[PDB]
Design an enzyme around this catalytic site. Structure first.
Site, mmCIF file in Angstrom:
data_model
loop_
_atom_site.group_PDB
_atom_site.id
_atom_site.type_symbol
_atom_site.label_atom_id
_atom_site.label_comp_id
_atom_site.label_asym_id
_atom_site.label_seq_id
_atom_site.Cartn_x
_atom_site.Cartn_y
_atom_site.Cartn_z
ATOM 1 N N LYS A 107 -5.941 5.037 -19.981
ATOM 2 C CA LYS A 107 -6.112 5.448 -21.395
ATOM 3 C C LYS A 107 -4.846 5.065 -22.199
ATOM 4 C CE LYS A 107 -9.802 7.078 -19.465
ATOM 5 N NZ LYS A 107 -10.210 8.499 -19.385
ATOM 6 N N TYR A 144 -12.779 16.917 -17.375
ATOM 7 C CA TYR A 144 -13.303 15.568 -17.301
ATOM 8 C C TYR A 144 -14.432 15.528 -16.264
ATOM 9 C CZ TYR A 144 -13.253 10.551 -16.301
ATOM 10 O OH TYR A 144 -13.597 9.241 -16.103
ATOM 11 N N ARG A 199 0.815 -1.221 0.000
ATOM 12 C CA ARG A 199 0.000 0.000 0.000
ATOM 13 C C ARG A 199 0.852 1.277 0.000
ATOM 14 N NH1 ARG A 199 -3.011 0.177 4.620
ATOM 15 N NH2 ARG A 199 -3.018 2.395 3.988
ATOM 16 N N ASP A 206 -3.285 17.685 -15.816
ATOM 17 C CA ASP A 206 -3.713 16.359 -16.231
ATOM 18 C C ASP A 206 -3.273 16.163 -17.679
ATOM 19 O OD1 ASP A 206 -6.880 14.530 -16.087
ATOM 20 O OD2 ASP A 206 -5.139 14.150 -17.355
HETATM 21 C C1 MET Z 1 0.399 -1.567 8.648
HETATM 22 S S1 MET Z 1 -0.160 -2.597 7.284
HETATM 23 C C2 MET Z 1 -1.512 -3.516 8.053
HETATM 24 C C3 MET Z 1 -1.052 -4.732 8.830
HETATM 25 C C4 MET Z 1 -1.841 -5.057 10.104
HETATM 26 N N1 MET Z 1 -3.302 -4.882 9.889
HETATM 27 C C5 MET Z 1 -1.354 -4.224 11.282
HETATM 28 O O1 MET Z 1 -2.004 -4.192 12.319
HETATM 29 O O2 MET Z 1 -0.316 -3.568 11.247
HETATM 30 C C1 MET Z 2 -18.641 8.749 -17.557
HETATM 31 S S1 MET Z 2 -17.383 7.461 -17.482
HETATM 32 C C2 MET Z 2 -15.857 8.418 -17.659
HETATM 33 C C3 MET Z 2 -15.740 9.315 -18.904
HETATM 34 C C4 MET Z 2 -14.779 8.818 -19.998
HETATM 35 N N1 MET Z 2 -13.500 8.321 -19.399
HETATM 36 C C5 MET Z 2 -14.511 9.936 -21.003
HETATM 37 O O1 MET Z 2 -13.428 10.049 -21.564
HETATM 38 O O2 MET Z 2 -15.371 10.765 -21.283
#
Ligand code: MET
Ligand code: MET
Lengths: 397, 392
Positions: B205, B108, B55, B180
């Site tokens: 894209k 967008y 993460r 963007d």
């Molecule tokens: C920090 S990542 C998540 C791992 C686990 N849930 C914890 O208590 O740390």
């Molecule tokens: C409404 S779904 C997202 C929009 C789409 N990615 C566009 O280019 O318009």
């Protein structure tokens, strides 16, 4: 007899929502690894933006592989609707961003998963949402903390990192009376052990990254609750405020993991029960917290709301911060890692790992001892796990 | 300093560091373990380089991020679960109540929804201004202005911003410029080299190119990217990119140059054709001499892109008939895929609205947008031709 009988948990974990005959006989559902969906007509297209027709347009909002995963998690939790997200934090943030605006108050369990605490205090808390922590085990205190601004009651049960528990039905009753939305992070139990929606909670969130996947190879989150709340979270929290889209590939792996949930959880719990009883009798151990032992402070609430006591153990070694380091470094089968619910057994000693930047003084009043080690008991042979812990206790002495 | 195509294939990876593997192994793992608690300790403080949890950081994602940073010419990259993930992680990190964000006149749709119905409802102030009108921009600046955010080119008329001029204005006020860059890719435009602080991408894209993953990218300075990682991503969105999808994205990036060359070459032909068709009232393609910001386009973009917007004379009815006749183009939202896509907002995405509600957002009743793909141009031409005939 009769057809109105609910299929057993394991049956639904494997089959719910999918009939091979709707997909060319494919025994396993095909994986919709596609970003976009097309329309036969602009009028059909108009109907999927005007809510006349069931269908698809863009995987960030909705996807058939994700929908199956979602309907299946809903069935297992006893909720109306599910939502699949890129992580547990995705589930938590998408939910709270949707339900809270400046001026609203959220009442929180006394301790929380670390990134949840940080989201609240350094994230949404900084955008004019008021936070108050309350002991959710004290219903009288919860009742007293309710105000007309209280919008959401949010907690884990059992809660990180102490496995403190809250009476879900009792909290739901207070919330019914005052008008607050109850959200329970149900990661530690899974719907196999505890079903907060059946106890009157409005929404449950999961880090599916943990037991639901069970194999440590994906990051994923789940929200389950009423159609109305889940739709709102989908269309506001997910679509606009987080973009926490779950990969269809990972959703398929999650569904694969869920097919053995009952069997893995049985073994996680049986192993941890054996380790906890062994640890309770070892000289080096001063204190053990496991919901399956009568010594557990909330033993009766655990027995009342969890069908089995879980795969997490927390215990205190004699020797403080020192003895922890020595126990941990000695482990040969348990891995030193911070996560839970993998097939592999994990151990953490927060004093010399996660919270090692703090000094001996500072870990207190956050609920963290100096010799506090946390175990995520895995799926290995119990005798190997016993031996590994036994040998590591010896080295810690 | 290796060329763009060399870097898109190789940058950040030496097979010799991974058992000779030509293609980097996929780190489909949620957690990482430590050899000691000591090694553990120096990761939750963060001064020994390693990993703890997919993460925050992961080697497949790290490689993707370095590669994207190199291609945009930035210090650091961040990989997220979607374009919306990149945008929300960025803006949640940079803004607090009382801050103001200055916005390009059109955005967008889901970005508009996030700003107006999401972060905007948490006390952050919004003002739209024309990012090509440098004096309107300067006049719009306030002490509260902390972020300038826009796309270039922007939907639905491919309006361009003066990136360099915006950045000059922003630095008088210390403001952060976020661009963007989804439509151009780093292959066609590099906003950081024109003075932007941060770029975001829907890698869903063109970067992916093949319509099979959802993904987002942020590239910029180490200090801003670090905060977006540790706050926006980790705490406020949880928009974690799968390592499987990251690896697919890197696979797609290996052909970015080649695909973009064909997307543009195909679009240039289609635009030339459309521009002289009697059913077509008006066309927006940066490659046409008629494009109002032709000159600015060519200063910022090395090629005019694979997107075309045009307006059919017969209004909403012509749009519907055009769209329904298409046999090779697919009726779909999205863009940047091998497959050619088309949409007509007035009868699709914005159909529930009214004529003047649509006009208010610059959505013409006959406006159709083409995402020109990689198919043989003669086939794309024939499809467009018969659809035009049907549109009558
Ligand atoms: C920090 S990542 C998540 C791992 C686990 N849930 C914890 O208590 O740390
Ligand atoms: C409404 S779904 C997202 C929009 C789409 N990615 C566009 O280019 O318009």
């Amino acid at each position: 007899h009769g057809s109105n009988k609910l299929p057993g948990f394991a049956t639904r974990a494997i089959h719910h929502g999918y009939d091979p005959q709707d997909h060319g006989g494919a025994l396993v559902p095909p994986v919709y690894q596609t970003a976009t969906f097309t329309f036969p007509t602009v009028e059909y297209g108009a109907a999927c933006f005007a809510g006349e027709q069931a269908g698809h347009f863009y995987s960030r909002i909705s996807n058939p592989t994700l929908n199956l995963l979602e309907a299946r998690m809903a069935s297992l939790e006893g909720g109306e609707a599910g939502l699949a997200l890129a992580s547990g934090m995705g589930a938590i943030t998408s939910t709270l961003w949707t339900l809270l605006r400046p001026g609203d108050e959220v009442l929180l369990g006394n301790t929380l998963y670390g990134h949840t605490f940080a989201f609240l205090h350094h994230g949404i808390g900084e955008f004019g949402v008021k936070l108050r922590h309350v002991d959710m085990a004290d219903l009288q205190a919860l009742e007293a903390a309710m105000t007309p601004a209280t919008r959401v009651i949010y907690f884990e049960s059992p809660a990180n990192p102490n496995m403190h528990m809250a009476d879900i039905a009792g909290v739901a009753k207070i919330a019914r009376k005052h008008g607050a939305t109850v959200v329970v992070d149900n990661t530690y139990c899974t719907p196999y052990l505890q079903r907060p929606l059946e106890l009157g909670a409005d929404l449950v969130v999961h880090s599916a990254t943990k037991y639901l996947s069970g194999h440590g190879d994906i990051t994923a989150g789940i929200v389950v609750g009423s159609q109305a709340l889940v739709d709102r979270i989908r269309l506001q929290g997910l679509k606009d405020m987080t973009g926490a889209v779950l990969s269809p590939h990972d959703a398929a792996l999650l569904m694969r993991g869920i097919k053995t949930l009952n069997l893995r959880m049985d073994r996680h719990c049986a192993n941890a029960q054996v380790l906890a009883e062994f640890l309770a009798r070892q000289p080096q151990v001063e204190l053990i917290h496991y919901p399956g032992l009568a010594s557990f402070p909330q033993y009766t609430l655990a027995r009342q709301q969890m069908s089995q006591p879980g795969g997490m153990i927390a215990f205190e070694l004699k020797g403080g911060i020192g003895a922890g380091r020595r126990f941990m470094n000695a482990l040969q089968l348990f891995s030193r890692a911070v996560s839970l619910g993998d097939a592999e057994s994990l151990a953490q000693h927060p004093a010399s790992m996660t919270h090692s930047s703090y000094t001996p003084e500072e870990r207190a009043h956050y609920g963290i001892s100096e010799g506090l080690v946390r175990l995520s008991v895995g799926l290995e042979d119990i005798d190997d796990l016993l031996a590994d812990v036994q040998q590591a206790l010896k080295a810690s002495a």
